[PDB]
Amino acid sequence: TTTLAFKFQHGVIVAVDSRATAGSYISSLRMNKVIEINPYLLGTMSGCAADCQYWERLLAKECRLYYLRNGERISVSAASKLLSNMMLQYRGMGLSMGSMICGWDKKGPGLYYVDDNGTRLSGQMFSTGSGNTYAYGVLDSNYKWDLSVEDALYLGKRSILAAAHRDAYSGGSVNLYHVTEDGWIYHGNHDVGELFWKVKEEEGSFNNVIG
Amino acid sequence: MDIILGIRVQDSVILASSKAVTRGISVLKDSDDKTRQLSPHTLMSFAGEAGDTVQFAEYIQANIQLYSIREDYELSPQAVSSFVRQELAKSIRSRRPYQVNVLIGGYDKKKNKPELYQIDYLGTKVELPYGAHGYSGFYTFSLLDHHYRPDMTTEEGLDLLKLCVQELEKRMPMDFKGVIVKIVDKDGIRQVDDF
Amino acid sequence: MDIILGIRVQDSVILASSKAVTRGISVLKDSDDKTRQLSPHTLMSFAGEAGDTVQFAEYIQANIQLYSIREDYELSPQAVSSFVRQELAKSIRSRRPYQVNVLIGGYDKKKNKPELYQIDYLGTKVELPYGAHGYSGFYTFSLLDHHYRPDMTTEEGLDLLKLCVQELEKRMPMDFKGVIVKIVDKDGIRQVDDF
Amino acid sequence: SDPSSINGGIVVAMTGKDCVAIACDLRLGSQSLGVSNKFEKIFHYGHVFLGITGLATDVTTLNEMFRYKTNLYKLKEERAIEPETFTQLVSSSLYERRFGPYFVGPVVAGINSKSGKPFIAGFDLIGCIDEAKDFIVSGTASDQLFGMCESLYEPNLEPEDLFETISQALLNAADRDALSGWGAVVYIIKKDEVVKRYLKMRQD
Amino acid sequence: TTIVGVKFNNGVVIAADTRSTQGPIVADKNCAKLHRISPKIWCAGAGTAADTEAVTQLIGSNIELHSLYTSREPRVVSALQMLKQHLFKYQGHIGAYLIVAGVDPTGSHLFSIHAHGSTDVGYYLSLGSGSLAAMAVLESHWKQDLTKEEAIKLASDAIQAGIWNDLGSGSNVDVCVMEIGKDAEYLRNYLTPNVREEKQKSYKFPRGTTAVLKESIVNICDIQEE
Amino acid sequence: TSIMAVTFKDGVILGADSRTTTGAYIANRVTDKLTRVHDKIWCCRSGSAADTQAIADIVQYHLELYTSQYGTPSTETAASVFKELCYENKDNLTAGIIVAGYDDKNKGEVYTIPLGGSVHKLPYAIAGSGSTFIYGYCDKNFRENMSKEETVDFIKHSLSQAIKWDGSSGGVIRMVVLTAAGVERLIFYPDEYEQL
Amino acid sequence: TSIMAVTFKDGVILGADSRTTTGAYIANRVTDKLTRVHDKIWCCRSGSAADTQAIADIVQYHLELYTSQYGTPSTETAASVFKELCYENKDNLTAGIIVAGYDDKNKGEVYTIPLGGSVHKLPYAIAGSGSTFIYGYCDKNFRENMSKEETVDFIKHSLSQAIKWDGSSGGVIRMVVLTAAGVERLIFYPDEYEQL
Amino acid sequence: TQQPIVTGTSVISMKYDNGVIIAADNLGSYGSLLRFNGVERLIPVGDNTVVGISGDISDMQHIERLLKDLVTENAYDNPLADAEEALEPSYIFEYLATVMYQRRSKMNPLWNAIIVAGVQSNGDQFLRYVNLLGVTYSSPTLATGFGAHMANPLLRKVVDRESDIPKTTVQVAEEAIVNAMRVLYYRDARSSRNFSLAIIDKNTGLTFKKNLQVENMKWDFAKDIKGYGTQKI
Amino acid sequence: QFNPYGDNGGTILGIAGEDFAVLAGDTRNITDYSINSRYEPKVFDCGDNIVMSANGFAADGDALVKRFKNSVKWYHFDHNDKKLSINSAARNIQHLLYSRRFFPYYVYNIIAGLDEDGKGAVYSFDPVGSYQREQCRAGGAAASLIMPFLDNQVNFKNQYEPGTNGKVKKPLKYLSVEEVIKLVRDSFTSATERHIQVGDGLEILIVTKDGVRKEFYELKRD
Ligand SMILES: *[C@@](C)(CO)[C@](*)(O)[C@H](Cc1ccccc1)NC(=O)[C@H](Cc1c[nH]c2ccccc12)NC(=O)[C@@H](C)NC(=O)CN1CCOCC1
Ligand SMILES: *[C@@](C)(CO)[C@](*)(O)[C@H](Cc1ccccc1)NC(=O)[C@H](Cc1c[nH]c2ccccc12)NC(=O)[C@@H](C)NC(=O)CN1CCOCC1
Ligand SMILES: [Mg+2]
Ligand SMILES: [Mg+2]
Ligand SMILES: [Mg+2]
Ligand SMILES: [Mg+2]
C-alpha cells in the first residue's frame, strides 16, 4: 500500500490507494483503506488488513464510548493514544499495522501516525506503506500551508498516483478525503488507470511513458 | 532512537537529543523531542527500541508526578535516578524487558548543585560530569575529556556541546537531523530554541 | 558505496554521485569521486561492495582505453555499455562475483545524442532518460517522473537534480555528504565545482 | 531472492488459422521498484520469434546467444532456421547448463516456411520442451495466463480475431500480477507478413 | 506421472500417461513420455522431464553409433548399462527414473532404472507418482504366459488407475508394443478418456475491442536488391 | 535386507531374501541379491543398491581381466578387489558386502566387508538390516563341516526368522550352492519357510 | 540392557543382566534390574534409570495403597498403573517396562509396556538393547507350559546370547521365580553362562 | 507434539448395497521391527458400528477405552439404550472427530487415522474418515496410509460413484476387500498376512471375522528372475 | 515435528447479481496427490438466506462453518428471531476469524446472499478476518486462474467499444442468473483442465428472494 495525509490552512487531506496483495498475486483491485470512526475522525490502513480492520473498528467502539460517557467528541490526540496502547498490549506478538489518525478537534486540525511498535507521532504530513517514499517526493516539493482546497486535494491524489505507478504493491484506485471543522468530506474513488492517462496529458508529466 | 548527550556544568545540566525518527527506510519526523519533564527541576532524555522508550518515560513521569502530589515535595535527582534504575533492573529479568537507555539531568535545590545520571537498559547507573548512550560517546568523549572543566558557565557548556554535535555530524554515517537542547538549572527547565 | 544518480537532457548527460566513504562506524572521507572516465565522451559512475567497485571500474577503463589506442577510435556509449554488461553477466556466475552497480553516461558524437545506461551487478542493462541504483530511485523517481522533459537544458537538468538531492537529504536516514556532479556533452566531460 | 521473480514479466503465444501470435509485457523491475516500461521480451531470428521471461540479464544474454548461433546456422546452411529446429537448439543450449541454469522461461513461435504449419513451443529453465497445439504461457503471471487462455481460446481463429483473444488474455492476467504490466506488445504472424501492436493498458 | 512395463508371450509392452506439471499446474495436457532409444528399444521416464529426455537422447545417440560400429542390432542390456553408469556418475542429480524395454537378438527384456543408478528386472513394473495405483492393478491381474492383447489391456488399465487416482497423472494413454520378430508399434494416444466438454459460451471478441497505440510492419525479410 | 553365507564340508552356500524397499514401499519383492562376480565366486549385497551394483560390476570386470592374464582368481583375491573399492571410496559409498567362493585347494571361503571397508574372513557371515535379529540363533546353531542338507536348513531357518522380524526383509529365499560339482540355485517360497 | 519375563506351568520367571553404562563406561556391573512393586508382582526396567526408578516407586506406592483398601491387586491392575504413567508422561519419559506377576486364579501373567505407553499381554516378553539379538532364538525355543528347570535354562541361554552380542548388556544373570510356593531369587555368573 | 512409536498400518473399507465392510491387519510395528503379531485394530461399538484405527497403538488403546466408556455412559438413565436411543455410527464418529480436532488445536494430537463404518437406524450406510489433524471426509471407499494409494484404486473400480453402491453385492465387496489386503501384503513392508474383517449389514447385522489369512499368493514367477540386468545364471 | 495444518485443495467462486447471488465450489477433497473423496460438499446453506464456504484446510473450514451456523442460531435466540442480514453476518465472521489471530483458521472464506435492499451480495474474507463486499470473487487453489477471467467477463476490464479505439469503454450491463451460471461452469471446467486439485464435481448454490436452490454438474475425474 500507499497512504498519505497532511495538515493545511483549510484542514487535512487524506489519500490512499486500494490495492491488496497476497505475495505477487493481486488479491483485491479495490479495498477500502480508510475508516470513518466518526464524522470528524478518519483512520488510514497499511500492513495486515485483518489487524488494520479489527483494531481500528475497536478504536471506533472505544471512541464512541468516550462520547457517551463525556457527552463530547474525543480528541485526535487521545484517540491515537488509545490505539497505540492497544498495540502495546500485543507487544512482539506479530501484529502489522501502520495508520494515520486524522481529524478536527478544539485545537484545530489533528494528525497522528501510529504503528504496531506503539510509536505515536504528531506531525504536519505523513505517508505509510510500501510506496510512501514515492509519495513523499511529490509532497515535499509541492506542499504549502497556503494551499487551496482544490490544489490540496489534487496534491494528495497526484502523490498516490506517483506511488501507484512505481510501486508494484500499490495501485487500483485513489480514495480522497478532506477533513474540515464541519467534519470529513469524501471526494470519490478515482481509478489509477484512467487517472494516469488524464494527468499525463493535462500535466505533461510521465513523459517517458508512451500513450 | 539514536543520539542523546548530557553535560553538567557549574550551575546547570544541559541535555541534547536528536530529532530524527525513522521507520523502515524513511525518516518520518525531524522534530521529535526525546525527553520528558519528571519534575520542575528534573529532566529525563531517552533512547532505545521503538515504542518502549516513550511508554517507559511516561510511566516514570506518572510515578514521579504521583509522588510529587502525594508528598507536596520534589524528589531529589538522586532519588529519582535510583527509582528509575530499580525499574530497569526489575525489567531486565522480565518476560519481555524494556530496551530503553536514559539520561537524567536535574538541579538539586537542597544542595544547590546540578546532577547528571546515566542509566542503561540493564539498570547500570553512574553519576557523571558528562555522558552519552550507544555510539554517541565514541565520537564525543575525547572532546569532553579535553575541554571540560567543572567551573564552566552555561554558555561555555553550550559551545562545547556544539563542538560535540559538529563532530557527530562529520564522522557518523547517520543523519540524526540535529538536536533539541534543554537546560536544567535553579530556575527550572528551558529549551534553547536556536541551535 | 551508496547514492549514484543520472539524468539525460536535450544535449548532455549529468551524473551525480555521493562523496562519503565509510569504514566501520567512521566516515573516512567526504570528497570521494565515485567515477572513471572511460573515454573523452563516456563517463561511468559506480556503487557497490568496498574495493570491488574501483577494481572493476579501473579494469573497464583499461579495456576501453586499450581499444581506443588500438583502433584510434572512440567506441559508442552503446558499445561500451554492452561490453560492461557482458563483463558483469560473466561475473555473476563466477566463484566470487563482483558486486558493482554502474551508470554509464556518454555523448554519441555520430548520432549527436546524449545516452544514459543503467547496469546492475547481475548484468541487467537498460537505457533510460534518468536512472539510479539501490534505494536512490525510491526517493527521486517520483520527482523525475513529474518534472522531466526530453527538451530540458543542462541548467534545467541541474536544477531538477538539486531538487532530487534535497529530497534525498531530507528523507534518507543516511548522511552521504553531498554529491559530485559531472556533465557529459559534445565538448567532453567537465565537473560542476559548485553544487 | 527467487531469480525467476526479481525482474518480473510475462509471455504468451497462441496458434490460429494459418497464423500465430506472441505477446509480452514491457515491465522490468527490481522487485517492488519499476525500472523500465520499454523492456521488450520478444526477439526474432529471421521468421522465428522467441519470447523470454525470467531474470533480465539471462534474457538479454540468451537473445545475444541465439542471435550468434542463428547467424552462424544461416551462413553454413545457406537458409534461415525453422521453428522446429530452433526449438531443439534452445533445448540443447539450456540443458548444457543443467547444473548452473539460465533462470528463464522461453517461448518459441513461428510458421514453417516450407509446410506453412503454425508452430509454438515452451520450455522450462533447463530445456524440457512443451510442444502445444493451442497456447504456451510463461512468467510471473503464468497461473493467471493459464486461466485466461484455457477459457478464452478456441482453435482456428483468424489473425484479427486471434489478436483480440491473446491481447485480452495478457492484459487481464497482467492486471492481476504486481510484477507484470507497464505496457504490452503483440506480434501477429502470418507466412509473409508480421504486424506488431503496442497495447494501451493501466500503468500501475 | 504414471508409467508401466509388462512382459508377455512373445515380447514386451510399455505405457504412460500424458500429463506434465509445474507444481499443481498442468503445463502440457498431451505430453509424450514414451521415448525411443533405438527402433526396438523404448524407454519411458518419470521425474525431471528434461533429464529423462536428455539422458535418453544421449544414450540413444551412442547406441546408434555402437550399432553402426558393431554391425549389430542394439541390445537392451547395452542401453541399460550405459544409462546406469551415466546416472551413477552424477549421483542422482540427474533425476531420471526410467522403465526400459525392448527386443533384440537375445529376446525380450524389461528393466527399471533409478536416478542413482540402481537397476531391476521384472515381468511387470511401474514408476512415477502413480506407480502404486498402477502396481495395485498389476498385482491383481498379472499372470504368467500373457498374450499380446491381454498385456496391452493390463498395461493401459494400470495407467488408467494412475490417471484417475493420482493427481500427478492424467489425460491420455500412450503405448508401445515390442514383439519378437516384428517392428515395434508406437500407439500414440491409444486411449482418449479425458476430452474437454464443449464450453457454454464463445469468448470471441468484437474486432476493435482492444485499445492500440501504435502499429508497424516488421521487416523479417533480408536486405533487398536495387 | 537379510543376507548370509555359510561354509560347510563340500563347499559354501550363499543365501538372501528378495525384498527391496523405498521407505515402507516394496519397490521389488523378487530381487536377486545373490550376484556373480566369477564362475564360483559370488557375493551378497547390502546397503545402497546403486553403490553395490556399481561395485560388483567393476569387480566382475577386474576378475574377468585377471582371469584372462593370470587364470582363475582366489576368493581372497576377489574380496581384496571389493575391499580396495569400498575402503578408498568410503566417503561416497554405503555398501556392506559378503564375498563367498569355492576353490578345489582352499575349498569354501567366506569374507565379509562392512561399511568402513575392512575385511574379515569367517566360517559363516550374516549382514543386512535383518541380520541383527538372528545373531543369537545363528551362533547357537552353526557348526563346522555340516552337510549340504544341514546347511540349507540352517540358512532357511535363519533367514526365516530375519524375514519374520525385519520389515525391510521378505519375499522368497534364494540360495546359491558352490561346490566342486558345480553351481546350484535354490529357491524357497513363503508357504515353505513361514511354517518353520 | 537385556531383560525378559517368561510364563510357564507353575507361574512366571523374570530375568535380566546386571550392566549399567554411561556411554562406554560401565557405571555399575552388578545392577539389580528386577524390581518389586508388590509381593508377587515384579517388573524389569529398561530406558532411563531415573525415569524407570521414579515410575516403579510411584507404582509401588499406588499398589501399597490399593492393597490397604481393596486387597491384593492383579498383575493386570499393576500393568495399568505403569501404563497410565508411561502414556500420560510419554513426552518427558524414556521407559520400557516389562511387568510380571503371579495370582492363584490367573497364575503367571506377563505384560510389556514399550516407549509410547501401549500395553501388550504376552506368554513371554523381551526388551532392552540386547533383546534385538535374540528375537530369533527366543521365538524358536519358547514353548508354553514349560517346567521351572526348562524355563530357567531358556532364560539363561537367551540372555547368554544377548550379553554375548550387546556391549550395553553383561555382568551376572539375575532371575526371580514367581509361583504359589513363594519368591525365589536366582543368580548365574559369567563362568556358568558364557560356556553355553 | 510427539512421534508415533508402535504403529498399525492401513485400514480399508467400502460401501455395498445393504451395508459396509471394513478390514485391517493384526500387526503392531515398532519402526522396521514387526514386534506384535496379535493386535486387533477393528473395534466394534454395539452391533451397528465398527471403528478401524491406524497409527499409534498407545493412542488407539486410549480411543478404544473412550469408546468403551461412551457405551457405558449412554446406557446411564436410558431405558432405550438397546433400541431407539442406542449409539449410532454418526454419533460415535462426530464424538471422535471432535476429540481429534481439539487435540490438534492443543498441539498434542492423537496420532491416528480413523474410519468409522456402520449402518444407521434408517438402514443408511455410514462411512467416514478422520485423522490426527481433525480432517474429515466421506466416500464410497475409504482407506488409510498405504491403503489410500493401493486399495482405493481397486475398490473404486467396483464402486466408482454413489450410483454403483446398490449394484454391488456383499460377495463382490468382500472379494474386492480380500484382494486389496493381498495386494497390501505384497507391497507394504509394514503389513502382515494375518488380518481381521468386519461386515455390518442392515439385514444380517454385524459379522466379525478373525484370524483371516492372505491366500492364493503368486510367487512362482520369482524362480525365473535372475540378477539385476546382465546376469544369466 | 507436528504440523497442525494441512491442505485439502478445492476452489470456490461467488458472483453477485442484480437481484441474486451464487456460491459455487468443486466437490473434490485431497491430500498431496491422493483423492479422499470425489463428492465432499463444501458450500453450505447456513440459514437466513445465507450461503457459506470455507476453502483451504477442511478441518478449520468445517469448524468455522459449524461455529457460524451456531452464531446464527444464537442470534435468533438472543434477538427475537430477527433475520441476520448479510452485512451483519460478515462482521460477525470477522470476529470469529480474529479470535484465532495467533493460531488462524487456515481458510479463505466466502459468503453470499442478498442485502437489505434485495440486491445480490458477496463478501470475501482472508484467514485472519479482513473482509470486504464484492461483486465477484474466486478463492482457493485455482483462484489465480479464475479471477482474471471474471475481471474480463463480468466487469468488462480491458474491453472497449469497437470503432472508438480505446476512447469509450464497454458499458457495465448487468448479468442474468443463466449468464452467470455459464461463466461459473466455464470457469471450473477451465480450472479443472489446468489444476490437479480441481475436478470430480461442481455444486452451485443460488440465492434469490425465493430461497436457496442447488445445481450439480459433473467435472473431469482425472
Ligand atoms: C500494501 C498493498 C502492502 O502490500 C498495503 O499495505 C495493504 C494494506 C491494506 C490495508 C487494508 C486493506 C487492504 C490493504 N496491505 C495488503 O494488501 C496486505 C499485504 C500483506 C500480505 N501479507 C502481509 C503480511 C504482513 C504485512 C502485510 C501483508 N495484504 C493482506 O493483508 C492480505 C493477506 N489480505 C488480503 O488480501 C485481504 N483480502 C480480504 C479478502 O478479499 C481479498 C483481499
Ligand atoms: C509425473 C507428472 C510426476 O509429476 C511425471 O513423473 C512427469 C514425467 C514427465 C516425463 C516427461 C515429460 C513430462 C513429464 N514429471 C514431470 O512432469 C516433472 C515434475 C517435476 C518437476 N520437478 C521435479 C523434480 C523431481 C521430480 C519431478 C519433478 N516436470 C518437470 O520436471 C518439468 C515441468 N520441469 C520443471 O518443472 C522444472 N523445474 C526444475 C526446478 O526448478 C523448478 C522447475
Ligand atoms: Mg504499481
Ligand atoms: Mg550506562
Ligand atoms: Mg557384553
Ligand atoms: Mg488423476
XYZ file of C-alpha atoms and ligand atoms in Angstrom, chain G residues 19 163-164 166-167 169-170, ligand 5:
8
model
C 25.196 -53.937 33.433
C 25.056 -60.462 26.642
C 27.441 -62.021 24.104
C 25.281 -56.491 23.186
C 28.002 -54.340 24.772
C 24.475 -55.821 28.442
C 26.567 -58.053 30.699
Mg 28.633 -57.849 26.818
